[PDB]
Design a protein around this ligand. Structure first.
Ligand SMILES: [Ca+2]
Ligand SMILES: [Mg+2]
Lengths: 155, 798, 135
């Protein structure tokens, strides 16, 4: 809740770059103000962003950096999940209780519950982490939950 | 999950298949339906002590009060087995889970200790040796809700633990409570020899089922007495046989038939042409509408045709052990009553003393008893006393006598009953060896009517006393579970609240005593009595009130309201000091003692008191007995008033469950810490509420969760094996789970959205410089080709 | 530096060692009906006066200043064509040019795709980047 000048500098490049994709003009569509933070480092949610300006559809309202930065505050604080937070929830489907869950069950979780993702999106991540569904169609929700967390550029 | 449990538990499918509902716990709650008693709903806007609301199947916008609004148990606890496990615990919630299992063929449930059961109207597989083979030995918590459970568990009781067992079964005989009873022994046997008694007793049925069971306004057939079929056991759990006992049977139905109610069935089968060969001997005609002690209103009934039995009974007789010799005395004796009410007299003009006209009937009955027809009126009209030294004849007001006879009509019957029992108590006295037993009492339970009187106040009193008994039981049963868990402080005994109402009846200067008093003084005036009770109670007792607001249709205005567990009942003490007088003319006794017939002898062989007086004690006899027998229960319920399966007039169950004790046992349950849980099944179910504070034990994992969560000490109490929370607690816990998962998932979802993009970022940065190079030169080019100069160069290249 | 001195002589008709507003339409009309005065004169408005060779290749060199190689450009496309198909789908590249980056105006657009290789809905960029680079 008080970006460092490093941190702010970083907010620029992103914002700057994200405004070269809607059309240079120093404006970022309220719709991407969620994707912008994701690039900065915070994994806010749709509720979180809708409640800071965020438009549901693209091209409904554009934002200036002077307007943007403010919103980037509200999002920095938004409750970010944790390994336990996750594991634990993914654990309430593992009736077998051994770290496994139906390949389709998962798909259900990710795009049938809460803020449903998009099948393409579920695929993209499933494809990007090589969550190789094994033998009888089962995955270790543990390791799927540790990959996504460690981002796409590994330690 | 086998085809046997096919009708016991619902296939685990519909558990995983529940879908529609999410339990927007905050809104969807039960509402008071005038057509269905309690229908499902959802809220919108709360103003004050008023609420604007719409319904589910319907969409009716009702305006309900913040009180009439009841909480809804979450999808979780549905079609739930033992209902003392629900988080919310009210009527609707109770009502439903019963209608729910019912609306799914299920007809057995555990309401705490009480085992509930509903008549199916369709005999079903449900009872089989295979099933019996399964339960056989299994403790409560092992298999589904089922009458068989109560039994073995009762069996297990009497054998393992030493003492005797009792299994109180009740429920308007529109619930077929009897068949369930059959079962209790079928099972009390098919497992007592596998290391008939059943059938035998089913024949005697139409015997006692043509006596103590009559058409009382609300039931073509109602046992008007209380049986305690004790089934004893020897040194090694051996069925010694079967014995019975007859508790307070109302004699009253004898002299006072109301407008829609006439005596007992017998005279209706006797006067019916079941046997013209035996139709006359007693001196009576075939019509069932011309017998002063019978024509007050009703006669023959619909599906009853009142014949065959008078013939089949004739058989049940021979069958056991007693010639037609005594069997004959019966038929005839039964007639004596008939004519007895058909006797006429008169006193003098402005004088007090009666005289006859009906010496013929007097002669009739008399000989049908072996007494000088002139013997009766001598000890009957103006009788003979027996003070200290010399018996003085007592002038006879039409009063004392007119009733004195109503006393003979009955007094005889009562014995003529208690005897009949002792007999069938003999036939099966096929004694082997006796040490214990597992009796099964059934008594007409509580009664709240459109017009309540003396007969009512009593059955209830009984019940009022009975239900207590239970409370106390569930008290001690609780008092151990707590101490068996280490987690234990305490609360006074439950069966105490009921004392207030009980002592307002039994104890000295109390409703009963008074009446027991005024039935002596010869000035007894309904109002006079009314007067004394008030002066004696009202204004200073909170169980004795005054006729409140007319609740239902058009009530039968009365003098007061007694605060019963079931509720506050309106009792019209009108004509009480008139029905309760059970006087004794110490002559008729002797006179009837040894006339000429054997029975006539021993019976009377072997004052001016009261029914209640006997009631009071006989009751003790009953209660006292009970206070030494691990109690069991069974509450059958008549789904509906139209023997129509599936249907359920909730209303008719709420009143029933209100009179069962179930609802009160709940109230009793509500107070303490019901909903208990194994730390085992507690952590896994509620670990999500604080995932970050779990080291990653069980009696600990949970320890924490409650702690980090901010669980208010009031709310619960840790045992040692499990944890207890206040009724409605889990409700919160659920709802909490419900959002966190939901969220935690979203956070997880919104952590995927991050990834996906942190991914493309770079690909996205390189791509900028491209759109720029493309965008840049395509412009350059767009410039040159438009340049008039680039028209010259292109023009010629010599 | 060569294709200006080789076709140098013909850059003018009468050869006053310099230029002439009249020797302009001299070798202009020779091929096709010339333009209206303001064009012949304005076409001179660039080099603010008597044009010379170095002051000729200061306009004819001024323009092509910031253009990339036929490979750079080429490469700038395929960053979009990932399955190395050597082709952008028609709507994908129009969208690129017209709504993102430094957008093209409805006209800028029009000119850009008038004569642009496009069979079956697949803008062939490797060639279009020839239609450009005088390939
Ligand atoms: Ca914009
Ligand atoms: Mg020239």
């Amino acid at each position: 809740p008080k970006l460092s000048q490093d941190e702010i500098d970083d907010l620029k490049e992103v914002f700057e770059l994200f405004d070269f994709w809607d059309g240079r003009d120093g404006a970022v569509d309220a719709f991407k103000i969620g994707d912008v933070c994701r690039c900065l480092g915070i994994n806010p949610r749709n509720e979180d962003v809708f409640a800071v300006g965020g438009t549901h559809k693209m091209g409904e309202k554009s934002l200036p950096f002077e307007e943007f930065l403010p919103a980037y505050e509200g999002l920095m604080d938004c409750e970010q999940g944790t390994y336990a937070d996750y594991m634990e929830a993914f654990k309430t489907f593992d009736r077998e209780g051994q770290g496994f869950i139906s390949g389709a069950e998962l798909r259900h979780v990710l795009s049938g519950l809460g803020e449903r993702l998009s099948d393409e999106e579920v695929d993209e991540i499933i494809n990007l982490t090589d969550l190789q569904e094994d033998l009888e169609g089962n995955v270790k929700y543990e390791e799927f939950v540790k990959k996504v967390m460690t981002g796409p550029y590994p330690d | 999950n086998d085809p046997d449990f096919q009708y016991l538990a619902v296939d685990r499918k519909k558990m995983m298949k529940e879908q529609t509902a999410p339990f927007d716990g905050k809104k969807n709650c039960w509402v008071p339906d005038p057509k269905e008693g309690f229908a499902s709903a959802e809220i919108q806007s709360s103003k004050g002590e008023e609420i604007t609301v719409k319904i589910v199947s319907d969409n009716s916008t009702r305006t309900v009060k913040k009180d009439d609004i009841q909480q809804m148990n979450p999808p979780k606890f549905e079609k739930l087995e033992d209902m003392a496990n629900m988080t919310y615990l009210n009527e609707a919630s109770v009502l439903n889970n019963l209608r729910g299992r019912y609306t799914a063929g299920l007809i057995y449930t555990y309401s705490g200790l009480f085992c509930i059961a509903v008549n199916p109207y369709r005999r079903l597989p449900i009872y089989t040796d295979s099933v019996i083979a399964k339960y056989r030995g299994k403790r409560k918590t092992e298999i589904p809700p089922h009458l068989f459970s109560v039994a073995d568990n009762a069996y297990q009781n009497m054998v393992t633990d030493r003492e005797n067992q009792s299994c109180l079964i009740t429920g308007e005989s529109g619930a077929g409570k009897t068949e369930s009873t059959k079962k209790v022994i079928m099972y009390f046997a098919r497992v007592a020899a596998n290391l008939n008694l059943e059938d035998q007793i089913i024949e005697a049925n139409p015997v006692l089922e043509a006596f103590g069971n009559a058409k009382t306004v609300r039931n073509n057939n109602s046992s008007r007495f209380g049986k305690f079929i004790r089934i004893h056991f020897g040194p090694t759990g051996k069925i010694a046989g079967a014995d019975i006992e007859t508790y307070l049977l109302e004699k009253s139905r004898v002299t006072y038939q109301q407008s829609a109610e006439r005596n007992y069935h017998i005279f209706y089968q006797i006067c019916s042409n079941a046997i013209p060969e035996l139709n006359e001997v007693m001196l009576i005609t075939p019509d069932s509408g011309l017998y002063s002690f019978i024509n007050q209103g009703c006669l023959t009934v619909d599906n009853i045709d009142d014949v065959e039995e008078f013939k089949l009974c004739d058989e049940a007789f021979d069958i056991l052990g007693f010639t037609k010799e005594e069997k004959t005395s019966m038929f005839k004796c039964t007639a004596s009553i008939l004519h007895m009410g058909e006797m006429k007299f008169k006193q003098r003009p402005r004088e007090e003393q009666a005289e006859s006209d009906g010496t013929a009937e007097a002669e009739k009955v008399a000989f049908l008893c072996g007494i000088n027809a002139g013997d009766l009126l001598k000890a009957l009209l103006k009788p003979k006393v027996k003070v200290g030294t010399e018996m003085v004849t007592k002038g006879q007001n039409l009063q004392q006598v007119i009733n004195s006879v109503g006393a003979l009509s009955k007094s005889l019957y009562d014995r003529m009953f208690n005897w009949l029992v002792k007999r069938v108590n003999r036939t099966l006295d096929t004694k082997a060896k006796r040490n214990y037993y597992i009796g099964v009492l059934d008594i007409a339970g509580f009664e709240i009517f459109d017009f309540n009187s003396f007969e009512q106040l009593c059955i209830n009193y009984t019940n009022e006393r009975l239900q207590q008994f239970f409370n106390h039981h569930m008290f001690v049963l609780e008092q151990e579970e707590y101490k068996k868990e280490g987690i234990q402080w305490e609360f006074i005994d439950f069966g105490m609240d009921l004392q207030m109402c009980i002592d307002l009846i039994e104890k000295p200067m109390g409703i009963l005593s008074i009446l027991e008093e005024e039935c002596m003084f010869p000035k007894a005036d309904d109002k006079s009595f009314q007067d004394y009770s008030y002066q004696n109670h009202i204004g200073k007792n909170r169980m004795f009130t005054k006729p409140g607001k007319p609740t239902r249709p058009n009530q039968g205005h009365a003098h007061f309201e007694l605060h019963h567990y079931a509720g506050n009942v309106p009792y019209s003490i009108a004509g009480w000091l008139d029905k309760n007088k059970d006087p004794i003319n110490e002559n008729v006794v002797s006179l009837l003692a040894v006339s000429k017939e054997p029975l006539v002898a021993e019976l009377f062989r072997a004052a001016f008191q009261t029914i209640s007086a006997v009631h009071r004690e006989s009751l003790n006899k009953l209660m006292c007995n009970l206070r030494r027998t691990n109690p069991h229960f069974v509450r059958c319920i008549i789904p509906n008033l139209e023997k129509d399966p599936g249907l359920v007039d909730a209303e008719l169950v709420l009143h029933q469950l209100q009179c069962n004790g179930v609802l009160e046992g709940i109230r009793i349950c509500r107070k303490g810490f019901p909903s208990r849980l194994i730390y085992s099944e507690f952590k896994q179910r509620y670990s999500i509420l604080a995932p970050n504070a779990i080291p990653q034990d069980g009696k600990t994992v949970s320890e924490k969760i409650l702690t980090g969560l901010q669980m208010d000490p009031s709310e619960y109490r840790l045992g040692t094996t499990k944890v207890f929370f206040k009724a409605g607690v889990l409700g919160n816990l659920e709802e909490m789970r419900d959002e966190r998962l939901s969220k935690i998932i979203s956070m997880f979802q919104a952590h995927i959205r991050g990834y996906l993009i942190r991914k493309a970022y770079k690909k996205l940065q390189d791509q900028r410089i491209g759109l720029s190079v493309i965008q840049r030169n395509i412009r350059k080019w767009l410039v040159l080709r438009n340049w008039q100069w680039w028209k010259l160069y292109a023009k010629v290249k010599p | 530096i060569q294709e200006m001195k080789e076709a140098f002589t013909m850059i003018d008709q009468n050869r006053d060692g310099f230029i002439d507003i009249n020797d302009l339409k001299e070798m202009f009309s020779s091929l096709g009906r010339t333009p209206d005065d303001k064009e012949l004169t304005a076409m001179l408005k660039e080099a603010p006066g008597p044009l010379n060779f170095t002051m000729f290749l200061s306009i004819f060199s001024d323009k092509l200043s910031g253009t990339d190689s036929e490979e750079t450009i080429r490469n700038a496309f395929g960053m979009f064509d990932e399955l190395d198909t050597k082709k952008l789908n028609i709507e994908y590249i129009k969208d690129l040019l017209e709504n993102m980056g430094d957008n093209f105006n409805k006209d800028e657009m029009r000119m850009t795709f008038k004569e642009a290789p496009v069979e079956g809905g697949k803008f062939d960029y490797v060639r279009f980047v020839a239609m450009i680079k005088g390939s």
